[PDB]
Design a binder for these strands. Structure first.
Ligand SMILES: [K+]
Ligand SMILES: [Mg+2]
Ligand SMILES: [Mg+2]
Ligand SMILES: [Mg+2]
Ligand SMILES: [Mg+2]
Lengths: 51, 61, 413, 51, 56, 69, 129
RNA sequence: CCUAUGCAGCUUUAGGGCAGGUUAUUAUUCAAUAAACUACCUUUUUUCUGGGACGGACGCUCUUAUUAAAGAAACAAGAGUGAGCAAUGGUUUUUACUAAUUAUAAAAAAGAAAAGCUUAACUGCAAUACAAACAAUUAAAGCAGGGGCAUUGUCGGCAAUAAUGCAUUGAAGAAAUA
């Protein structure tokens, strides 16, 4: 990775913004939830929980 | 509380803004009643403007 | 001063108390400290060889009393507990039955002790009851371990205490002295080789006189706590002193008051001691001890389980909660129990008439899994008795009993 | 709204019953900084209903 | 005396002193004074909890 | 980034998605008082020392200096 | 203990010689509360660390001992002198402390002398009273 | 002799340090701090070049030869520059005027000067191209907001071609969290 002495990669600025903590959640789409119910893997006649 | 105070300050400043603009324009207008160069009939209008406008602005400053 | 400087001061903390590990003692007190806190036999031997002539009565007594602790058991005869640390009455391990000392430590201890015994005799007449008790206790430990076979000065130690109707004890007796004397004598009469007939008679006679005249008649039992009282009960049980029950009741009362301080290894000893003596009328005492196993189940070992069950069967005390605790603990420790030990445990349940589903279910699964089973005549009848007494039925116990019978018939000595 | 211990009880209740342990208790309330993020405090055994 | 770094000590007087005080009085005196004169002469003792109860 | 430089970074295993890393302590209900650390400012200065610095920012390894004695 | 040895090995070559000289005086003085302190220097413009020793100021004093009826010369540090004065003097210091804490041959010999003399006088006085 | 990821010894008013002595200040009955003097420890002391040293040079524009597309080197040649302007910027009107720049055949519906009003020397974005190893550098139709002069056109600094400096570290105004 050495470029001969020019060191062109460290001539760019630095950003310090902190991403939102919600990037640590598991994402579930509504379209995927319906597909499971249609196939019969989920019971739609009772409350659905994360369990 | 801080947001309320900051909003109050800006509102007051905008209320006084029209008067500040009027003074700004007025201070740069030539008052021909105090000009004696025309009596001399020697200098042009531009030279008259510089001579008297500069004196007024510096005195105000 | 272009380059600014920051200064930090670091203090080197040191232990408050000195360990006499490397320096040579140069005073009466320093020599005593080095001997007492010695860590290895090589250190004790070095001190004796170099400073042999700078010894007094106290120095000889201290060296003898610390020698038993410098003799270590084999690492193969010890099992380490999970996360247990040294504390008051609790060790980080439990001992397997009949533990043996380290191979390379016996000759050192025997050689060192022989030298000490040679120079001691002149100091026999300058001993106090505390010093006599410690010497008796030390030798008993040295006999339980394979260091000595008898105490050369036993006749003198017993005479010193007995003279003048225990006059020396009447003024310089404490709770520790009685616990050490009785416990030491018991280990000198039962541990290792059984005994000599004359030695047995003298020890038993002295213990009977000491207990009645001092602890009972003079009420010196007030100086005993739960632990000291328990130690005396164990000693009496090993000596089979069943004739006098007045002291047993007094000792049981002390144990009852301080039940909370006893650990599972001490409660089991009390059960066995009472079972040996046949004292089974103290149901209240048994109930209090049983209540002590509820919270300290993590400090129980296979020896405690075996002793508790056998003692209960002999005493005839049946507590469902206590038996349930022992059964569940034994089910997991099946790998630690020996074939003979596990047969006695099964027989104990049969005598009590208690059927423990988890315990017997685990045993049956293990026996069936074994391809070739070899049951010995010594315990073949015990395991069969346990199944019959425990009421185990055709589900899988008949198959286990069937294999038991076939293995026994396979040899038929 | 679930806490660290509460989420475990929701997902694996058998992990506690098999050991004869009581289930984790639910939280009392959430920090005000999260107002507008949650509608109710989760119950370790959820209450199922008909739909 | 706590922050005196050993320069000042609490003293219990056993006998009347010309300037330090009277018998039974607890006072503060310079460390050097007690070290050289009051202590070796036997006119006072250090203000330990045991000495205070016994004498003060 | 220029294609030649980008491929080297990917070939070395560069896969960052955000400018910085998320803080697990910010997730509601998962705050651990024991593992508390005040937020610090990221350092932007590369380690360019040719003796103990980054091997990608120097042409070759230089000998270490002498210790004070 | 492990950290103490690690720090000691980082001392400057001349500071190590000074440290050994200080330790060799333990048997000749009343060690008491004397402790070892290390000086560490750090700089803003470089990542360099210098380790050196901080010396102990020894004081020669004469303390009164009523049991011995004598002024005993002693070499002390300021902290040790403060502790002895607070506890109640030389006699109380020697009679309230076990031999293990002394950590000095000079101190141990002095303590042993006081203890034996105290017992003799006390026994005689007790028999009288 | 020259060339090195060079090595070593020696010297000093080359940089940094205090770890012995002296000296200064302070404190306890052989101690702590140091922009000083002596001793000691550690570190630095470019490249190009008709060999090296000595001398000279290193950014950015214009012009000359290698023809009339572009491009093109040498310690080749001839000249500039590290700014200035609150108007010498923006925009309307008039006419006996058509210059000047370091240098130069720019320019007539264009400029310069004179007279009047002004702050676009803006906020948020941008198709498509010139150039170019990369970094950056250059031109720009058009859309929304608030304005200036006109009255439906122009204004995102200055005829054009030079008047410059990455990241890091530091500092200021405002806003959002915690
Ligand atoms: K040449
Ligand atoms: Mg060169
Ligand atoms: Mg590019
Ligand atoms: Mg317009
Ligand atoms: Mg323009």
């Amino acid at each position: 990775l050495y470029d001969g002495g020019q060191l062109g990669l460290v001539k760019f600025p630095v950003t310090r913004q902190i991403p939102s903590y919600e990037v640590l959640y598991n994402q579930l789409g509504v379209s995927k939830l319906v597909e499971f119910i249609q196939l019969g893997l989920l019971d739609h006649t009772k409350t659905i929980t994360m369990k | 509380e801080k947001r309320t105070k900051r909003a109050k300050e800006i509102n007051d400043a905008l209320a006084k803004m029209p008067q500040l603009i009027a003074d700004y324009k007025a201070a740069r207008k030539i008052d021909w009643a105090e000009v004696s160069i025309i009596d001399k009939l020697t200098l042009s209008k531009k030279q008259i403007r510089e001579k008297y406008v500069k004196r007024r602005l510096m005195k105000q400053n | 001063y272009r380059n600014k400087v920051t200064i930090e001061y670091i203090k080197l903390k040191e232990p408050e108390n000195d360990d006499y590990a490397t320096r040579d003692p140069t005073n009466y007190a320093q020599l005593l400290g080095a001997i007492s806190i010695s860590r290895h036999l090589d250190r004790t031997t070095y001190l004796y060889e170099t400073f042999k002539d700078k010894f007094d009565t106290i120095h000889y007594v201290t060296a003898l009393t610390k020698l038993p602790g410098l003799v270590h058991y084999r690492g193969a005869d010890l099992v380490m507990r999970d996360g247990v640390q040294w504390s008051e009455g609790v060790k980080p391990f439990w001992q397997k039955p009949n533990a043996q000392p380290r191979k390379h430590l016996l000759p050192k201890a025997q050689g060192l002790l022989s030298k000490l015994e040679e120079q001691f005799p002149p100091h026999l007449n300058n001993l106090f009851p505390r010093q006599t008790a410690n010497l008796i206790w030390a030798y008993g430990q040295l006999k339980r371990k394979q260091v000595v076979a008898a105490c050369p000065f036993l006749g003198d130690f017993l005479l010193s205490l007995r003279r003048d109707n225990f006059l020396a004890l009447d003024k310089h007796a404490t709770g520790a002295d009685y616990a050490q004397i009785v416990k030491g004598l018991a280990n000198l009469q039962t541990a290792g080789s059984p005994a000599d007939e004359d030695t047995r008679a003298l020890i038993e006679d002295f213990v009977d006189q000491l207990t009645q005249e001092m602890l009972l008649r003079r009420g010196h039992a007030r100086l005993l706590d739960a632990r000291e009282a328990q130690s005396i009960l164990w000693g009496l049980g090993k000596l089979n002193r069943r004739k006098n029950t007045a002291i047993i009741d007094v000792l049981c009362d002390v144990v009852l008051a301080g039940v909370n301080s006893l650990t599972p290894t001490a409660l089991a000893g009390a059960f066995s001691a009472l079972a040996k003596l046949g004292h089974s009328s103290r149901t209240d005492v048994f109930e209090a001890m049983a209540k002590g196993y509820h919270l300290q189940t993590t400090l129980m070992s296979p020896q405690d389980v075996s002793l508790t069950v056998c003692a209960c069967a002999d005493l005839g005390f049946r507590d469902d909660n206590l038996l349930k605790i022992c059964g569940l603990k034994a089910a997991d420790m099946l790998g630690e129990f020996s074939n003979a030990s596990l047969a006695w445990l099964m027989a104990g349940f049969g005598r009590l008439g208690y059927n423990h589903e988890a315990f017997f279910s685990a045993v049956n699964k293990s026996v069936l899994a074994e391809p070739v089973v070899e049951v010995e005549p010594g315990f073949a009848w015990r395991v069969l008795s346990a199944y019959a007494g425990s009421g185990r039925k055709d589900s899988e116990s008949l198959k286990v009993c069937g294999r038991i019978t076939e293995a026994f018939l396979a040899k038929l000595y | 709204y679930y806490t660290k211990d509460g989420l475990e009880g929701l997902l694996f209740p058998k992990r506690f019953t098999d050991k004869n342990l009581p289930l984790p208790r639910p939280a009392v309330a959430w920090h005000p900084k999260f107002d507008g993020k949650f509608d109710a405090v989760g119950q370790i055994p959820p209450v199922y209903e008909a739909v | 005396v706590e922050e005196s770094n050993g320069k000042l000590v609490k003293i219990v007087l056993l006998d009347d002193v010309d300037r330090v005080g009277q018998q039974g009085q607890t006072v503060v005196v310079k460390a050097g004074l007690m070290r050289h004169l009051l202590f070796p002469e036997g006119k006072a003792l250090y203000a330990t909890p045991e000495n205070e109860a016994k004498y003060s | 980034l220029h294609k030649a430089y980008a491929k080297k970074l990917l070939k070395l295993g560069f896969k960052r998605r955000f400018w910085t890393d998320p803080d697990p302590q910010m997730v509601p209900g998962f705050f651990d008082p024991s593992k508390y650390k005040p937020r610090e400012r990221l350092n932007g200065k590369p380690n360019l020392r040719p003796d103990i610095g980054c091997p990608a920012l120097r042409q070759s390894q230089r000998p270490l200096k002498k210790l004070p004695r | 203990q492990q950290k103490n040895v690690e720090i000691a090995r980082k001392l400057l070559p001349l500071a190590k010689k000074q440290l050994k000289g200080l330790l060799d005086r333990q048997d000749n003085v009343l060690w008491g509360k004397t402790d070892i302190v290390i000086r560490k220097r750090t700089f803003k413009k470089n990542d360099e660390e210098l380790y050196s020793l901080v010396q102990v100021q020894w004081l020669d004093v004469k303390l009164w001992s009523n049991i011995l009826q004598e002024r005993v010369p002693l070499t002390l540090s300021q902290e040790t002198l403060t502790h002895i004065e607070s506890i109640g003097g030389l006699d109380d210091y020697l009679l309230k402390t076990p031999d293990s804490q002394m950590k000095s041959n000079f101190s141990s010999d002095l303590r042993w002398r006081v203890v034996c003399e105290a017992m003799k006088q006390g026994e005689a006085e007790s028999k009288q009273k």
